[PDB]
Short mmCIF file of C-alpha atoms and ligand atoms in Angstrom, two decimals:
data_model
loop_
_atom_site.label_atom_id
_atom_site.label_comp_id
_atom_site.label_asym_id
_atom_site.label_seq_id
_atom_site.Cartn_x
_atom_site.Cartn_y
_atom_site.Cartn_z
CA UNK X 1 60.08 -12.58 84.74
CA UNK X 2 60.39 -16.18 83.62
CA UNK X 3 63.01 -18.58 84.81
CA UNK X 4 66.18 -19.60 83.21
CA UNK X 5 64.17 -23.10 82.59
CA UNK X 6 60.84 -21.08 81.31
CA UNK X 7 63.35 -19.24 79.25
CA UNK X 8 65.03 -22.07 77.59
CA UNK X 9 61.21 -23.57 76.52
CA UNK X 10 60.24 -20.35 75.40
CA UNK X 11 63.44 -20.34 72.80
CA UNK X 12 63.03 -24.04 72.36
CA UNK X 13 59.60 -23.92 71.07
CA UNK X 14 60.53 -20.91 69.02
CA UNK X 15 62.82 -22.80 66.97
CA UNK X 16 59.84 -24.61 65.92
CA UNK X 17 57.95 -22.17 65.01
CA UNK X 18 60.50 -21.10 63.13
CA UNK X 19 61.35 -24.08 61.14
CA UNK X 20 57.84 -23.34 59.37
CA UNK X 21 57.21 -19.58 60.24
CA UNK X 22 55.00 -19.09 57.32
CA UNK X 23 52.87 -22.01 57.95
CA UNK X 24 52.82 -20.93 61.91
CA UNK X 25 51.31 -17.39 60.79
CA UNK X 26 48.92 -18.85 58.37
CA UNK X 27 47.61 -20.68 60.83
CA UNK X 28 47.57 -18.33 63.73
CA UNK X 29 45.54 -15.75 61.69
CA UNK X 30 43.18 -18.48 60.44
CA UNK X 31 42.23 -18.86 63.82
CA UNK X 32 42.59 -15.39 65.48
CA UNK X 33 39.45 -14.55 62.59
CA UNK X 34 37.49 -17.83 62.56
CA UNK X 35 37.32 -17.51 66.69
CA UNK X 36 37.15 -13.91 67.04
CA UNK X 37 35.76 -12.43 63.41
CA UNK X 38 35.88 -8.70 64.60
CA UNK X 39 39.46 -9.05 64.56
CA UNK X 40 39.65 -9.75 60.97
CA UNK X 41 37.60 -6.17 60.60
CA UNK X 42 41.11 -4.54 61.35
CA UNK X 43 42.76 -5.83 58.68
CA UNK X 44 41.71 -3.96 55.35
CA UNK X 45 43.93 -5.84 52.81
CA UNK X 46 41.68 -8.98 53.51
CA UNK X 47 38.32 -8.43 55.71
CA UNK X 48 36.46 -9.25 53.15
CA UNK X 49 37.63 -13.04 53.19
CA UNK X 50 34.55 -15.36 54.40
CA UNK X 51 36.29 -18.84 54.47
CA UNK X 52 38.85 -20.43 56.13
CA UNK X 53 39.31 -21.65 52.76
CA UNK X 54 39.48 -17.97 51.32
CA UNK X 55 41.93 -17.60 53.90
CA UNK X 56 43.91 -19.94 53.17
CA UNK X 57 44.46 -19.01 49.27
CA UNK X 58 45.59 -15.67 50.52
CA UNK X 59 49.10 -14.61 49.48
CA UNK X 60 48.58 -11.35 51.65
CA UNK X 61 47.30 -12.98 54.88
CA UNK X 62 50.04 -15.72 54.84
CA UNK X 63 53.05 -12.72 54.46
CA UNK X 64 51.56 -10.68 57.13
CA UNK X 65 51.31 -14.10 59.66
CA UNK X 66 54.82 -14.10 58.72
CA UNK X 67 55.51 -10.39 59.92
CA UNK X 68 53.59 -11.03 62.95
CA UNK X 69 55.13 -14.11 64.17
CA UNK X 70 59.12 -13.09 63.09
CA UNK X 71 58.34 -9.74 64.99
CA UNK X 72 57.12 -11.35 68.19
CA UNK X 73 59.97 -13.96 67.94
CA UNK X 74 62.72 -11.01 68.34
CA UNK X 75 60.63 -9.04 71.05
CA UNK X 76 60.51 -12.61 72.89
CA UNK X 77 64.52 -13.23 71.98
CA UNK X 78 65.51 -9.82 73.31
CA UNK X 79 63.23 -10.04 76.51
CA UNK X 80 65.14 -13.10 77.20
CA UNK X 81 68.60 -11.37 76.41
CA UNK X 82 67.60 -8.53 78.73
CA UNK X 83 66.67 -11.12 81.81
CA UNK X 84 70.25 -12.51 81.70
CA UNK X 85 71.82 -9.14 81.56
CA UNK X 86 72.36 -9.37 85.34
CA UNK X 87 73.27 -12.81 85.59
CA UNK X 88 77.35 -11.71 86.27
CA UNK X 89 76.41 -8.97 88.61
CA UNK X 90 73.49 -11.03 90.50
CA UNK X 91 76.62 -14.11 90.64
CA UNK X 92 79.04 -12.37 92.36
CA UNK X 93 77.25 -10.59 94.68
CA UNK X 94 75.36 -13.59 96.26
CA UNK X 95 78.05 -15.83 96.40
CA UNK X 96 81.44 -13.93 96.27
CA UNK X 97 81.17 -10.66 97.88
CA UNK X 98 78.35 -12.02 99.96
CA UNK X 99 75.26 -9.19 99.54
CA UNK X 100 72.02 -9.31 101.19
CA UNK X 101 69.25 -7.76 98.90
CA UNK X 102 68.33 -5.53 101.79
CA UNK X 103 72.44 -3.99 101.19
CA UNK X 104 71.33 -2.90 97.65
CA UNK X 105 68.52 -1.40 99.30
CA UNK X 106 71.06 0.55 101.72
CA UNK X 107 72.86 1.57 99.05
CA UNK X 108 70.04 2.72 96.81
CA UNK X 109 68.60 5.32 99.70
CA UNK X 110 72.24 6.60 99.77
CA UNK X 111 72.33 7.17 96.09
CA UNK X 112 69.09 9.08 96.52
CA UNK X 113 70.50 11.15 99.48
CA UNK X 114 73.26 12.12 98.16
CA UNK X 115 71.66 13.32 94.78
CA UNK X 116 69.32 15.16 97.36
CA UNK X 117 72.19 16.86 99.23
CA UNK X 118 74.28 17.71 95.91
CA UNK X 119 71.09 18.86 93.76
CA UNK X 120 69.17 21.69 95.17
CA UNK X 121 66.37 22.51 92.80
CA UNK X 122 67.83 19.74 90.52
CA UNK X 123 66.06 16.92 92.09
CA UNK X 124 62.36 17.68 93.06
CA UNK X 125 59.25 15.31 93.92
CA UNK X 126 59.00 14.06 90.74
CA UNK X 127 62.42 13.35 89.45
CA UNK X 128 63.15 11.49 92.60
CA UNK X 129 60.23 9.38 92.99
CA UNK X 130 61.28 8.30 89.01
CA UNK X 131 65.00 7.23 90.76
CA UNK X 132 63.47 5.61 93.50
CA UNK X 133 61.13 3.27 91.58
CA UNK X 134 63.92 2.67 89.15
CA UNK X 135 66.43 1.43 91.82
CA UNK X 136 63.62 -0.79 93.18
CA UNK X 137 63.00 -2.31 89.97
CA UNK X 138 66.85 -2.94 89.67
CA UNK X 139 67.22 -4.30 93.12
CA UNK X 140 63.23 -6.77 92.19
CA UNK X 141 65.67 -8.45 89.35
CA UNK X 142 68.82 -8.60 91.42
CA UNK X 143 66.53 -10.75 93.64
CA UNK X 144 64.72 -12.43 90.99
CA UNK X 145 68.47 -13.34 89.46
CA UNK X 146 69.19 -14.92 93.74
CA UNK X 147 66.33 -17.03 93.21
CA UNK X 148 67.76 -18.46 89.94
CA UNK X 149 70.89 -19.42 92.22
CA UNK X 150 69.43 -20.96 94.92
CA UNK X 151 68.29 -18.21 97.22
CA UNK X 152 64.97 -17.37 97.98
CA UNK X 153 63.59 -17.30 101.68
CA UNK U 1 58.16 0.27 84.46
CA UNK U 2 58.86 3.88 84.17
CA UNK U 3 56.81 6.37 81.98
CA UNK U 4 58.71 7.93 79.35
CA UNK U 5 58.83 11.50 81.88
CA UNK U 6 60.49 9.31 84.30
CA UNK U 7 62.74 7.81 82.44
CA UNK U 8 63.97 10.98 80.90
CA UNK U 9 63.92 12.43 84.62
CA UNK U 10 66.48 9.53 85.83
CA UNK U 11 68.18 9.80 82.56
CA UNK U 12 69.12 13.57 83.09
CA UNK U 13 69.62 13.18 86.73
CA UNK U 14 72.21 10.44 85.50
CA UNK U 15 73.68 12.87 83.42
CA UNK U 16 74.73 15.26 86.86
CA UNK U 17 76.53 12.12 88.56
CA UNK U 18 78.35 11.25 85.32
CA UNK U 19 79.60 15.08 85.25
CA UNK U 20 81.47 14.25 88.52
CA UNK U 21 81.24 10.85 88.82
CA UNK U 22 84.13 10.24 91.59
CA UNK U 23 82.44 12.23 93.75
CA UNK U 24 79.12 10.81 94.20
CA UNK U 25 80.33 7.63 94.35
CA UNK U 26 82.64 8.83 97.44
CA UNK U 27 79.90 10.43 98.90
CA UNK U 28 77.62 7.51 98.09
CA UNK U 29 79.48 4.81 99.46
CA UNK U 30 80.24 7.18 102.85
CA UNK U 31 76.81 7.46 103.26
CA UNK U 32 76.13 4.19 103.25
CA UNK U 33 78.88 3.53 105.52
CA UNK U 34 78.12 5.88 107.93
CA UNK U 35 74.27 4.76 108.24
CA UNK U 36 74.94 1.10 107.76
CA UNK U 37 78.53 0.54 109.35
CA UNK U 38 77.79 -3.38 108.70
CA UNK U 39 77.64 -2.95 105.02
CA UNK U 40 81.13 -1.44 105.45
CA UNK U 41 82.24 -5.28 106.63
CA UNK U 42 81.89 -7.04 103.20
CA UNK U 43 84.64 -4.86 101.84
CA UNK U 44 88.06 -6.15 102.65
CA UNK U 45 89.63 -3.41 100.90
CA UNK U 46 89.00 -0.77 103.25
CA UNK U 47 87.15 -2.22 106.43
CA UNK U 48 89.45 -1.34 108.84
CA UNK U 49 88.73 2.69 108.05
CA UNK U 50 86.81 4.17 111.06
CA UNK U 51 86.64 7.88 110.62
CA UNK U 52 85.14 10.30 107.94
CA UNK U 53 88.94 11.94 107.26
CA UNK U 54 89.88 8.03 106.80
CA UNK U 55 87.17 7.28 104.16
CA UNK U 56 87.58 10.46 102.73
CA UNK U 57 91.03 10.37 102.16
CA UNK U 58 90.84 6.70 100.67
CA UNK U 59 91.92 6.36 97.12
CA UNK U 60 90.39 2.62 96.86
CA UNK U 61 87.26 3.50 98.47
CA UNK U 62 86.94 6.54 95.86
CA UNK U 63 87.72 4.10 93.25
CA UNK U 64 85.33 0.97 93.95
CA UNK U 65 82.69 4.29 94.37
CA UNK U 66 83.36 4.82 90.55
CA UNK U 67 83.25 1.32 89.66
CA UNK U 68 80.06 1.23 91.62
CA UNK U 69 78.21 4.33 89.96
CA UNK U 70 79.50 3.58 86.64
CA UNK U 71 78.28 0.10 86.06
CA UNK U 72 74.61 1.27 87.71
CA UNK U 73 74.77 3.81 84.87
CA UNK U 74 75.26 1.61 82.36
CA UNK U 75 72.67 -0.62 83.93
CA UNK U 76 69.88 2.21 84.14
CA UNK U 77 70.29 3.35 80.29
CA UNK U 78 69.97 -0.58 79.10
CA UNK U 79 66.75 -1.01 81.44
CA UNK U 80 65.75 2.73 79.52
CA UNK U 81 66.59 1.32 76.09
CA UNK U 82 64.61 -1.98 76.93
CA UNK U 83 61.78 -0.55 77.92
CA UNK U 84 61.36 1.80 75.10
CA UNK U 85 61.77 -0.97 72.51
CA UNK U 86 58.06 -2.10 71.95
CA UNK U 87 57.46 1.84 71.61
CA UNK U 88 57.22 2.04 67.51
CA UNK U 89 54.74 -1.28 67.81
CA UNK U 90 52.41 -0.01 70.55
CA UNK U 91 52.35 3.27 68.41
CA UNK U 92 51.28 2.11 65.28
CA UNK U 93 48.65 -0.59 66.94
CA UNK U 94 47.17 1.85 69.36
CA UNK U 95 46.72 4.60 66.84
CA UNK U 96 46.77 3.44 63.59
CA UNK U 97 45.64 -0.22 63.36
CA UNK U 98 43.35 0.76 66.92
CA UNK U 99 44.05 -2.87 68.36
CA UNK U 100 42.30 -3.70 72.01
CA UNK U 101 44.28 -5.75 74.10
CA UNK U 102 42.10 -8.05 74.54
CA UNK U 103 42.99 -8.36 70.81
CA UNK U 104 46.67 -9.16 72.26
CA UNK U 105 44.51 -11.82 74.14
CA UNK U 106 43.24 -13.52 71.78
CA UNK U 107 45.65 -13.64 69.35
CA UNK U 108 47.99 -15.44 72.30
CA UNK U 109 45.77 -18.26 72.66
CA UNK U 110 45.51 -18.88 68.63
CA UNK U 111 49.50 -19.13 69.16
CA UNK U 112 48.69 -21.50 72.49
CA UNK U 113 46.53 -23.29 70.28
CA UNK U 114 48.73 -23.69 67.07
CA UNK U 115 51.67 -24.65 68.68
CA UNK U 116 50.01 -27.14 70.71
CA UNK U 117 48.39 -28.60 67.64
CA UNK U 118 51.51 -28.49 65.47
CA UNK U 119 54.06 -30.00 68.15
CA UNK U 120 52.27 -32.79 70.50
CA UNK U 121 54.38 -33.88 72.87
CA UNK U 122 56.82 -31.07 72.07
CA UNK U 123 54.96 -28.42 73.79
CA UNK U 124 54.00 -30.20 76.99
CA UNK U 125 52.63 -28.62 80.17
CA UNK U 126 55.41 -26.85 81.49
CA UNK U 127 56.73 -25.55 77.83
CA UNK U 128 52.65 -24.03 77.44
CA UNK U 129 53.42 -22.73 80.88
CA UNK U 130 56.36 -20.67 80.15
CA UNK U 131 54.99 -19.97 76.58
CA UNK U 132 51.88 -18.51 78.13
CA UNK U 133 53.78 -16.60 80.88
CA UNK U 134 56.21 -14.49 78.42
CA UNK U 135 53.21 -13.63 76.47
CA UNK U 136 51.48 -12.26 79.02
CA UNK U 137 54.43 -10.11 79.90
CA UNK U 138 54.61 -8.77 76.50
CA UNK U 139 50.85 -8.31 76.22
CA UNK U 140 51.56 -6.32 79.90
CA UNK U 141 54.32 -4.39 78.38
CA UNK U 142 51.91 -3.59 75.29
CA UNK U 143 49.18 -2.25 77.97
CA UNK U 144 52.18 0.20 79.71
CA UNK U 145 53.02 1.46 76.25
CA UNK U 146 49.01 2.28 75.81
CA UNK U 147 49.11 3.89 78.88
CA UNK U 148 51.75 6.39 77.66
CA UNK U 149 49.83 6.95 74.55
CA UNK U 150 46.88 7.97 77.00
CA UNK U 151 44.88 4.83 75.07
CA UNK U 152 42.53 3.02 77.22
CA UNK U 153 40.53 0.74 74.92
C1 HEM J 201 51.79 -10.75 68.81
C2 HEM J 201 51.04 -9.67 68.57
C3 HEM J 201 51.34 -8.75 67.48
C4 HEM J 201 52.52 -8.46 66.85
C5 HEM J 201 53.92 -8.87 67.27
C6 HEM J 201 52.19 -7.62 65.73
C7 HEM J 201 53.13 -7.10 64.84
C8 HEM J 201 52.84 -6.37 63.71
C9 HEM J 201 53.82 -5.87 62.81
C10 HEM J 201 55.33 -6.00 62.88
C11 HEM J 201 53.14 -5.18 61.86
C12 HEM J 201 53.80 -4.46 60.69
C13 HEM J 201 54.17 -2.99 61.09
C14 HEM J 201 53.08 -2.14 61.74
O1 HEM J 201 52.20 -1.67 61.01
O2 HEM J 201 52.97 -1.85 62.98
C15 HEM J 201 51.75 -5.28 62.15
C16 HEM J 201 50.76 -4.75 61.38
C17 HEM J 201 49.46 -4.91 61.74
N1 HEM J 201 48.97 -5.49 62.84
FE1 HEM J 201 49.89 -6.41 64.21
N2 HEM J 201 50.87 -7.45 65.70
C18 HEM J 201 50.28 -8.12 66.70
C19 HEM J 201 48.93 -8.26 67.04
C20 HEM J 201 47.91 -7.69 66.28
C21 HEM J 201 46.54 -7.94 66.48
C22 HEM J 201 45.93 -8.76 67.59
C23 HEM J 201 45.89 -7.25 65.48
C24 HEM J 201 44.43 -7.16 65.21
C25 HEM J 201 43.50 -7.88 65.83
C26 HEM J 201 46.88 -6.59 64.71
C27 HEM J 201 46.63 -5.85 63.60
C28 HEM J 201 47.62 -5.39 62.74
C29 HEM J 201 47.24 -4.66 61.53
C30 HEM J 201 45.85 -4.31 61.02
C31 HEM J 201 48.38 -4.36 60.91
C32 HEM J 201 48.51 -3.67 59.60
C33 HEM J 201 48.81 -4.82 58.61
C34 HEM J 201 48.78 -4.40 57.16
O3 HEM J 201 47.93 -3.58 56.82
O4 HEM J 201 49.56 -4.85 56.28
N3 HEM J 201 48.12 -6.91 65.18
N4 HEM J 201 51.57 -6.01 63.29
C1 HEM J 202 73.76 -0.45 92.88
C2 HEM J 202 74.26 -1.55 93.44
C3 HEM J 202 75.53 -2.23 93.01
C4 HEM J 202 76.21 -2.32 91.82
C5 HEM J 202 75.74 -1.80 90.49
C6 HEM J 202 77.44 -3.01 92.06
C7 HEM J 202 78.40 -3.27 91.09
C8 HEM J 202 79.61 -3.86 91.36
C9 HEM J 202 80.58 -4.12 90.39
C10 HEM J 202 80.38 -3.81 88.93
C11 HEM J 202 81.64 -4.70 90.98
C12 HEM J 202 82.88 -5.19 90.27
C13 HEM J 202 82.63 -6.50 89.51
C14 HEM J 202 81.98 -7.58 90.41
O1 HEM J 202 82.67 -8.01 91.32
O2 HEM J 202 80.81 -8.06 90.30
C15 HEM J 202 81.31 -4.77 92.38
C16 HEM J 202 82.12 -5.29 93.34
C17 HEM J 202 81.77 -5.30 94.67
N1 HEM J 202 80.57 -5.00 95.23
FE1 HEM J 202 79.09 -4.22 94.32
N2 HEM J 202 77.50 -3.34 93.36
C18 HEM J 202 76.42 -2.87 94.00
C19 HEM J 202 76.08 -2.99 95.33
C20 HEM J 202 76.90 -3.50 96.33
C21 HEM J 202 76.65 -3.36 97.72
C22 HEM J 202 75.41 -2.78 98.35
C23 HEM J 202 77.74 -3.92 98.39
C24 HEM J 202 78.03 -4.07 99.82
C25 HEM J 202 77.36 -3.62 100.88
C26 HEM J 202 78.64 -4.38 97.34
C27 HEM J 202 79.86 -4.94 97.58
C28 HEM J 202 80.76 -5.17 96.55
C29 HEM J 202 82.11 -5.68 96.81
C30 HEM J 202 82.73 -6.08 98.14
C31 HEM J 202 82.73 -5.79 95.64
C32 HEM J 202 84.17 -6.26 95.43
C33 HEM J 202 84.99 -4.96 95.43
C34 HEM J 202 86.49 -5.14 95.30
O3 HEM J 202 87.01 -6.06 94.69
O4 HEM J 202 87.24 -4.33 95.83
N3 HEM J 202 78.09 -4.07 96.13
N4 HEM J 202 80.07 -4.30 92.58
#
């Protein structure tokens, strides 16, 4: 993940981008295909285009930079929504009720136990190896979130 | 991340705890107890219980169990929904438009490039830093996606 000061120059250098998306995209493209011209063999509205200057004039090209860019600004605006999800959570458990990330840990082998114990033939190999790597990617961001506050070691 | 099996196997197997939800957390938080008596220290609530018939019988202990189970729930299913949002886009470029991720590559460093040419001094160091770190985790996210298609290229 990034960190909360990554995250705010990520979203502060979006606005920019923003302020002129259409530009941005034009420009992007333009140099995507002049640097790497089998890219611009995907594209069949405009793969015929020679020029930078052909590029340019291109109506087409400068809407789908457009597309491109506003569509990677949300995916980048929602990762960053979805990194602070835990911020409340990750809060008060470090510094009000006091948890040690090896706790969550604790708690995540009894949640597999007991889903062992009350699921016979409802929770085989696979199925639990799928819970198992999901609590450990809950409890990874939990940590990741202790870092932000100060805790690390 | 999960594949899309695994996330439907933790989904379901979410499904069976919410069907009794009480319950497992009871039997979550006694397990945890019982193997890890020092976890049982950080909750004031209910510290002072000693034997199985005393946690059993607790009402609060039953109820921070809910609490407990319930807010993980909601906390798997967002992780679920996040991770299947780049679906749609890793579809249509892995099949349809038949984009290599090295593609992904490239097209990163034209945005590297255009936003350092477009905002001197405004996208310093650290800002291409973080810039060049979220893209890489969406170009990584783009690869796992791939990998569910069974795509290699
Ligand atoms: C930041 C990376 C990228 C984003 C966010 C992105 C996003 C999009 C979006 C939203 C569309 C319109 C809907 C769709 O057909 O899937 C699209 C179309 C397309 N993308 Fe991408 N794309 C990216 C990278 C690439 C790269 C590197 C290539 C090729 C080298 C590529 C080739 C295409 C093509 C050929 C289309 C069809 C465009 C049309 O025919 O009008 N994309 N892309
Ligand atoms: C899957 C892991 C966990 C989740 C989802 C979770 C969630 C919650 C939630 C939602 C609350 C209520 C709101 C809040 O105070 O933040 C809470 C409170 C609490 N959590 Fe956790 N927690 C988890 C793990 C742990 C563990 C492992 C411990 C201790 C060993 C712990 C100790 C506490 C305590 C003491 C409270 C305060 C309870 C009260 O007021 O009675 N938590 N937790």
């Amino acid at each position: 993940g990034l960190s909360d000061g990554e995250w705010q120059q990520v979203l502060n250098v979006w606005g920019k981008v923003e302020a002129d998306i259409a530009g941005h995209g034009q420009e992007v493209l333009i140099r995507l295909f002049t640097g790497h011209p089998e890219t611009l063999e995907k594209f069949d509205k405009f793969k015929h285009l020679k020029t930078e200057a052909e590029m340019k004039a291109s109506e087409d090209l400068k809407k789908h930079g457009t597309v491109v860019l506003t569509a990677l600004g949300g995916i980048l605006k929602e990762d960053g929504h979805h990194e602070a999800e835990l911020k409340p959570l990750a809060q008060s458990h470090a510094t009000k009720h006091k948890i040690p990330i090896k706790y969550l840990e604790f708690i995540s082998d009894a949640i597999i136990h007991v889903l062992h114990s009350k699921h016979p033939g409802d929770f085989g190999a696979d199925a639990q190896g799928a819970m198992t790597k999901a609590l450990e990617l809950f409890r990874n961001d939990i940590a990741a979130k202790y870092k932000e506050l100060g805790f690390q070691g």
